Symmetry: D2
Subunit: 121 residues, 4 copies
């Protein structure tokens, strides 16, 4: 699924996820968020299962973006955990955790959770 995953993906928010899958399981690229006071591209890295089950299962993957680039610093990071589903309409189906740097007093509200679905169009 190296070629399956490599490319440009869009989620339901209009965000842009540009990734290369390495033969070794690497994910590298850039993320551009349509929401959350992000601007321009942010580095992302992650991993995927480079030898997935042959049984019709999705391919497990995740990646991280720290929301610091030359334009802005949100003092936060998102991880997306999900699976690549190949075929007519290839999807990456994810759930994500965004942790903001906080004081101990605000640690309880440090983390947002959501779900993003990525498509090739």
């Amino acid at each position: 699924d190296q070629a399956g995953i490599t490319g440009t993906w869009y989620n339901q928010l209009g965000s842009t996820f540009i990734v290369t899958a390495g033969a070794d399981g690497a994910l590298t690229g850039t993320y551009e968020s349509a929401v959350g006071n992000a601007e321009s591209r942010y580095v992302l890295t992650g991993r995927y299962d480079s030898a997935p089950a042959t049984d019709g299962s999705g391919t497990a993957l995740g990646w991280t973006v720290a929301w610091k680039n030359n334009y802005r610093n949100a003092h936060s990071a998102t991880t997306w955990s999900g699976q690549y589903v190949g075929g007519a309409e290839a999807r990456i189906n994810t759930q994500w955790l965004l942790t903001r740097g906080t004081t101990e007093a605000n640690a309880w509200e440090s983390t947002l959770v959501g779900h993003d679905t990525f498509t090739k169009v």
Copy 2:
């Protein structure tokens, strides 16, 4: 916090997280899980906020492990999202999402969620 983060961390399960923080926000290293039929070291990559708030806030970070190495393939990936808290007892406080590759029929039960706290001892 590059030096703060770089090193060997342990969670409440006896898992071992070995990471280097790059000046550019990179996280690279290896993870060894004490649970979940993992064996030996797995590659991890992630990101951290290399220019955190100066106001006593934690430093946002996350990373990914795909559970494939030369020993095993769980057909899964975990992301940890959290923050590094410096000082006497440095912590990485995380929440995690583990996605298993599944069929569409099992996609609803694809994802586990938990929380790991990492200490330097």
Copy 3:
């Protein structure tokens, strides 16, 4: 939104959520899961914001199902946290946590996370 919420809802899995919203913020009813070896109806209870913002915001709500009825006992419970969005196509948009009773040794894999979207058709 008492009348808005009261009724029969379906999620993307074909599950059936039958709820009454009380004037006091109560949610009571039954859930029938199309997946996960559930059979027939299970009691649910929850709460909703009976005096929501007037500013176009959704109405916050959640509810719990313990997966025990006269037919089966999964030794588990799901909570759905989300918001009711009124209008042409009323939705309840949720995220959920399913905790299984486990031993301490399996506590780390106790909890599944997902997202369900409920519609009136």
Copy 4:
């Protein structure tokens, strides 16, 4: 575990959870949050597995609080999903989702996630 669960519990934040477990699986009571601009008691309802496994497993449960009482309205709701662990030091180990009522434009940041551990002291 009806008697096990019934009582007054405290989490790591100094919050107060007062619950009665019904013979029928009901949870009813009040929650007082030490954080998050909550004041005084809020109604909670939930469910627990009234016939748990006999094998040393925890007892699955969850409950909901909508953050409206006579003092305040946060336009939000939290669900706690977890398990009751009996014995010398009885615990309720939970993970929680807090959904705020939002506009569609802010729906992506509607939901906070955390973990609370409740003890009888």
